[PDB]
C-alpha cells in the first residue's frame with residue numbers, strides 16, 4: 001500500500017548483524033556515527049514512533065529536537081511531554097517525507113506502506129534473546145544497495161543499506 005499516499009514514507013533503523021534492534025527497553029549498542037546519520041536523514045521532517053520507543057528515549061532527547069514527533073498509541077495521551085499523539089499509523093501519516101523511527105511494532109504497521117528503508121547494520125555479536133525486538137524482514141518487493149564497511153571511533157564496524165520499493 002505504498003501508493004495509498006502521496007508523501008514518501010521511509011523506515012529507518014539500526015540493527016545488529018543478527019537482526020536485533022532492541023533489548024531491555026533500549027538499544028543494546030552505542031554507535032555515535034549511526035546517531036549522526038539518523039539525525040542528518042530525519043532533521044526537519046516528521047518522525048513517527050511507537051509509544052514504547054517514545055518512553056525509551058532519555059529525557060534529554062525527548063522530543064527529538066527539530067522534528068515533529070508523532071507517537072502512535074492506543075492511550076488517550078501521554079505523561080511525557082512533547083509528542084503529538086495519534087491512534088493509528090494512518091492518522092500519523094496524513095496530512096503530510098515522513099520517517100518511521102521504530103520500534104518493531106510500528107515498523108510492522110508501516111512496512112506495507114513504506115517506499116524506502118534506511119538500515120544501519122552494526123557488526124556487534126548479539127545472539128538474539130527471548131524478548132528482543134528484531135528487525136523487519138524485507139521481501140521481494142524491495143531493491144537495495146549497500147555502502148562499504150566503516151569503522152567507528154569506538155571500534156565497531158558498521159555500514160548502511162538503502163532499500164527502495166521496486
Ligand SMILES: NC(=O)c1ccc[n+]([C@@H]2O[C@H](COP(=O)([O-])OP(=O)(O)OC[C@H]3O[C@@H](n4cnc5c(N)ncnc54)[C@H](OP(=O)(O)O)[C@@H]3O)[C@@H](O)[C@H]2O)c1
Pocket residue numbers: 012013014015020021022023024025026027049050051052053054056072073074075087088089101102103104105106107109133
Ligand atoms: N535499533 C533501532 O533502530 C530502534 C529504533 C527504535 C526503537 N528501538 C527499540 O525497539 C524497542 C521498542 O519497540 P516495540 O516494538 O517494543 O514498541 P514500539 O513499536 O516502539 O511501541 C509499541 C506501542 O505502540 C503502540 N501501538 C502498537 N500498535 C498500535 C496500533 N495498531 N495502534 C495504535 N497504537 C499501537 C502501543 O502503545 P500503547 O501501549 O501506548 O497503546 C504499543 O505498546 C525498544 O527496545 C527500542 O529501544 C530500536
Ligand SMILES: CCc1nc(N)nc(N)c1OCC1CN(c2ccccc2N2CCC(C(=O)O)CC2)C1
Pocket residue numbers: 012013014027034035038039057058061064065100101102119120
Ligand atoms: C540512533 C538510533 C537509531 N538509529 C537509526 N539508524 N534508526 C533509528 N530509528 C534509531 O532510533 C532513533 C531513536 C531511538 N533514539 C535514541 C535512543 C537511545 C539514545 C539516543 C537516541 N537518540 C536521541 C535523539 C537523537 C537525534 O537528535 O536524532 C538520535 C539518538 C532516537
